[PDB]
A paper describes a structure:
Discovered in 1968, [name] [name] (EcRNase III) is the founding member of the [name] family of dsRNA-specific endoribonucleases found in all kingdoms of life. Among the four representative family members, Rnt1p and Drosha process stem-loop RNAs only, whereas [name] and Dicer also process long dsRNAs. Bacterial [name] functions as a dimer, and thus removing two negatively charged side chains between the protein and RNA promotes consecutive binding and cleavage of long dsRNA by multiple [name] dimers. Each EcEEQ molecule contains a specialized endonuclease domain (RIIID, residues 1–147) and a dsRNA-binding domain (dsRBD, residues 156–226).
Here, we report the crystal structure of EcEEQ in complex with a stem-loop RNA (RNA6) at 1.80-Å resolution (EcEEQ:RNA6), showing how the E38A and E65A mutations stabilize the protein:RNA complex and how the Q165A mutation eliminates the sequence specificity of EcRNase III. Therefore, the alanine mutation of both E38 and E65 stabilizes the resulting protein:RNA complex and thereby promotes the inside-out processing of long dsRNAs. Hence, the Q165A mutation eliminates these strong hydrogen bonds and thereby abolishes its specificity for the +3 G nt. As depicted in Figure 4(a), these Mg2+ ions (MgA, MgB and MgC) are ‘organizers’ of the cleavage site assembly by coordinating with four catalytic side chains (E41, D45, D114, and E117), three nucleotide residues (R-1, R 0, and R+1), and eight water molecules around the scissile bond. We predict that all prokaryotic [name] IIIs employ the third Mg2+ ion to assist two-Mg2+-ion catalysis of RNA hydrolysis.
Residue numbers in the entry:
A (entry chain A), B (entry chain B): 1 to 226
Write the structure that this text describes.
Amino acid sequence: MNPIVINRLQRKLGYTFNHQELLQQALTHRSASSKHNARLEFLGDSILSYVIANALYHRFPRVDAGDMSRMRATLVRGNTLAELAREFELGECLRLGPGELKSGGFRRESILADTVEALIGGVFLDSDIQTVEKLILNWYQTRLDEISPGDKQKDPKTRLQEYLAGRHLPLPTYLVVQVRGEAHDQEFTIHCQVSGLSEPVVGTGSSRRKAEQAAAEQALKKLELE
Amino acid sequence: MNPIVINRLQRKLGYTFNHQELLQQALTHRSASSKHNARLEFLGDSILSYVIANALYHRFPRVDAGDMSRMRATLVRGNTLAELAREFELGECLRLGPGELKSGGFRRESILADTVEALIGGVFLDSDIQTVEKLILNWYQTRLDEISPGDKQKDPKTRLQEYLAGRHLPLPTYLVVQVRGEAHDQEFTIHCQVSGLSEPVVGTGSSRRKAEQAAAEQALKKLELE
RNA sequence: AAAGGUCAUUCGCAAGAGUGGCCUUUAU
RNA sequence: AAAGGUCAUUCGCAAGAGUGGCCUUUAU
Ligand SMILES: [Cl-]
Ligand SMILES: [Cl-]
Ligand SMILES: [Cl-]
Ligand SMILES: [Cl-]
Ligand SMILES: [Cl-]
Ligand SMILES: [Cl-]
Ligand SMILES: [Cl-]
Ligand SMILES: [K+]
Ligand SMILES: [K+]
Ligand SMILES: [Mg+2]
Ligand SMILES: [Mg+2]
Ligand SMILES: [Mg+2]
Ligand SMILES: [Mg+2]
Ligand SMILES: [Mg+2]
Ligand SMILES: [Mg+2]
C-alpha cells in the first residue's frame, strides 16, 4: 500500500497505527487477496454497536429502549457508515482487485461501509477498547450532537403502516409496475395503494424497498399527515 | 432489597455492586415499576455481543465471519442467556409485579434472559468495560472452551433448506395440521413434506417455528443426511 | 449479524476472486 | 435489536402494569 495515501488517512482518522499490517488488512477487500478485512469487519461492527449504545444511553437518560434502538440504527446502518467513509475519502485507500478497479468498486457503498467497520476492528487490535471508543466518539460527535429521538427516526414504511394499523385500516399494498435497466443495475417504480387515497402513489429507487420507502413518504404527505 | 438474596447473587455473579441502586434496577421487571431494567437490557446486549465477538475472534483465528456469526448467535441467543440465568438462580432475585408472581413469571425464559443482559449493563455502569468484559469471560469460560465452528452451528431448518436448494430440489412444505390448547398456551403440530420422503415428517412445539425445527430435524435423519 | 439459491454483471485463456437485483432461512 | 396490530391471558373495582401465540415493518 502506498504510504502517501495511508499517512493521509491516519491523519484524518486521528489515529497512527503501531502495526501497519493491521491497517493494510483492514483496507483490503476480498476481491484483492485471500487475506482480507471480513473478520475485522465482524469485530468492528460489534464494537461500534456497543460504543453507540453506551453513548445514547448516557446522552438520552429519559428515552426508552425503543428510542435508543431506532437512534442506534440511524447511526450504524450501512448508509451512515458509507457517509463517514466518504468524509474520510476512504475510497482512495481501498485495496481492490482488478475487476473492482474497473467497475467503480472504490465508490461502492457496501465496500466503503464494510471498510469503516474493519478499520474499527483494526484500531481496536492495535490499541484497546478505550482507545477505539474515543475514536468512534470523535468520528460521530456531530451526528450524536444533532440526533433526536421520536418518530423522526422511524422510516416512512413503518410510519405509514402504524398510522393505518392504529385506525384499523388495511395495510398498504406495494406493487412493482415497472423495472428499467439490466438485471444488475435497475430502477424500480412502485405503486402504493393506501386506504383513503383514490389514486396510487408512486415511488422510485434502485431496489424495491427503496422505491417502497419513497412511495410511503409520498403517501404520508398526500394523507396530510406530515 | 433483601441482603440474603443479594449476597448470594453477588457471590454467584462474582461481583459486588458499589451502587446497589443499579443492581436493584437491573433486577426490576417492567411489571413491577416504571423504573425498570429495559434500558439496561439494551446496553448489556450490546456489551455482550462485543465481548463474545472479541473472544471468538481471538480463539478462532482461522474461521471466517460466517463461522463467528453463527457461534456468537449460539452463545448470545435468548435460550443461552436463560441457561445462564438458571445457573445464577436469577429467578429468586427478580423483582416482579403481582400478576407475574402469580403466573410463574420468575420462570419465564424471556424475563430471565433479559435480566442477564440488564445485569451486564448494571455491572458496566458500576465499574467499566474492562471489568464487565472479564466477568462475562468468566461466565462463558466453559462454553467458549467447548464451542466448535462448522455446520453444527446451523439450525435444522437452515440445514435442510441448504441441502435441498443445493440440489435444485423443492424447499420443504411446513403444514400446520393441529393447534391444541388456548390462544396463549398452544401446542403446534407440523407436517413437513420433503422431496425424497414418502410420508410427511412430524414436529411439535409451543410455537410454529419450534415445531418446524423439530420436524426439520427429523427430516434430516430420515433422509440419512445426519 | 450471517447463510443458501437464483438472474445479471467487472477482471481473467482458464482456474478463480468479486459486485448488483430478487427469493428463502437463522440470530440479535 | 426494536416498533405496531391482533387473539388470548396473570394481577387489579377500575385506572393501569405485564405475559404467550400469530401477523406486518425497520436496523444489524
Ligand atoms: Cl495532505
Ligand atoms: Cl433524555
Ligand atoms: Cl459525525
Ligand atoms: Cl421485485
Ligand atoms: Cl481457528
Ligand atoms: Cl432461576
Ligand atoms: Cl400458524
Ligand atoms: K447474489
Ligand atoms: K402480543
Ligand atoms: Mg454493521
Ligand atoms: Mg458489517
Ligand atoms: Mg440479546
Ligand atoms: Mg435483549
Ligand atoms: Mg454483513
Ligand atoms: Mg428485545
